[PDB]
Amino acid sequence: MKFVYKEEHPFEKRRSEGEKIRKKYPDRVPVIVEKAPKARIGDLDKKKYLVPSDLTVGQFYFLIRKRIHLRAEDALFFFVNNVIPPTSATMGQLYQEHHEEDFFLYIAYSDESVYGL
Ligand code: NI
């Protein structure tokens, strides 16, 4: 999916920020989270997060659900390179496998699970 953040910040600047954050705070992972445009749910308040590497995907799901006022009963899916990661993965593992070359991890969220964004 295209991210508004990538459209509005040039690569070299994103990179410079990502590198710096990872050098300075090696136990944090910088993430950009955006809603798939057609998804008919709540938009996100904050798009940039610096999370603990040992935070789980399930925990981050709980945080984002709670920011957009969704309960366990509402569909919400995270997509990273079009893969929906397991709740047991840590954000640090996700970052290591799937960070972009600007040193940020990109998560797209939607209410549909089957199709790539
Ligand atoms: Ni609120």
Curated annotation (Swiss-Prot):
Residues 48-50 are annotated as: Interaction with LIR (LC3 nteracting Region) motif of ATG3. One of its GO terms (biological process) is positive regulation of proteasomal ubiquitin-dependent protein catabolic process. InterPro entries: Atg8-like (IPR004241), Ubiquitin-like_domsf (IPR029071). Gene3D superfamilies: Phosphatidylinositol 3-kinase Catalytic Subunit, Chain A, domain 1. Changing residue 54 to H: No effect on WDFY3-binding. Impaired WDFY3-binding, but no effect on SQSTM1-binding. Heart, brain, placenta, liver, skeletal muscle, kidney and pancreas. The record marks 17, 28 as: Interaction with LIR (LC3 nteracting Region) motif of ATG3. Keywords: Apoptosis, Autophagy, Cytoplasm, Cytoplasmic vesicle, Cytoskeleton, Golgi apparatus, Lipoprotein, Membrane, Microtubule, Protein transport, Transport. GO terms for molecular function: beta-tubulin binding; GABA receptor binding; microtubule binding; phosphatidylethanolamine binding; ubiquitin protein ligase binding. It holds the Pfam family ATG8. Changing residue 116 to A: Impairs localization at the autophagosomal membrane. The precursor molecule is cleaved by ATG4 (ATG4A, ATG4B, ATG4C or ATG4D) to expose the glycine at the C-terminus and form the cytosolic form, GABARAP-I. The processed form is then activated by APG7L/ATG7, transferred to ATG3 and conjugated to phosphatidylethanolamine (PE) phospholipid to form the membrane-bound form, GABARAP-II. During non-canonical autophagy, the processed form is conjugated to phosphatidylserine (PS) phospholipid. ATG4 proteins also mediate the delipidation of PE-conjugated forms. (Microbial infection) The Legionella effector RavZ is a deconjugating enzyme that hydrolyzes the amide bond between the C-terminal glycine residue and an adjacent aromatic residue in ATG8 proteins conjugated to phosphatidylethanolamine (PE), producing an ATG8 protein that is resistant to reconjugation by the host machinery due to the cleavage of the reactive C-terminal glycine. RavZ is also able to mediate delipidation of ATG8 proteins conjugated to phosphatidylserine (PS). The record marks 116-117 as: Cleavage. Residues 36-117 are annotated as: Interaction with GPHN. A lipid is attached at residue 116 (Phosphatidylethanolamine amidated glycine). Residues 1-22 are annotated as: Interaction with beta-tubulin. Residues 117 form a propeptide. It is found in: Cytoplasmic vesicle, Autophagosome membrane; Endomembrane system; Cytoplasm, Cytoskeleton; Golgi apparatus membrane. CDD domains: Ubl_ATG8_GABARAP. Residues 36-68 are annotated as: Interaction with GABRG2. GO terms for cellular component: actin cytoskeleton; autophagosome; autophagosome membrane; axoneme; cytoplasmic vesicle; cytosol; GABA-ergic synapse; Golgi membrane. Changing residue 67 to A: No effect on interaction with TECPR2. Interacts with GPHN and NSF. Interacts with ATG7, ATG13. Interacts with ATG3. Interacts with alpha- and beta-tubulin. Interacts with GABRG2. Interacts with RB1CC1. Interacts with ULK1. Interacts with CALR. Interacts with DDX47. Interacts with TP53INP1 and TP53INP2. Interacts with TBC1D5 and TBC1D25. Directly interacts with SQSTM1. Interacts with MAPK15. Interacts with TECPR2. Interacts with PCM1. Interacts with TRIM5 and TRIM21. Interacts with MEFV. Interacts with KIF21B. Interacts with WDFY3; this interaction is required for WDFY3 recruitment to MAP1LC3B-positive p62/SQSTM1 bodies. Belongs to the ATG8 family. Ubiquitin-like modifier that plays a role in intracellular transport of GABA(A) receptors and its interaction with the cytoskeleton. Involved in autophagy: while LC3s are involved in elongation of the phagophore membrane, the GABARAP/GATE-16 subfamily is essential for a later stage in autophagosome maturation. Through its interaction with the reticulophagy receptor TEX264, participates in the remodeling of subdomains of the endoplasmic reticulum into autophagosomes upon nutrient stress, which then fuse with lysosomes for endoplasmic reticulum turnover. This is Gamma-aminobutyric acid receptor-associated protein. It comes from Homo sapiens (Human). The gene is GABARAP.
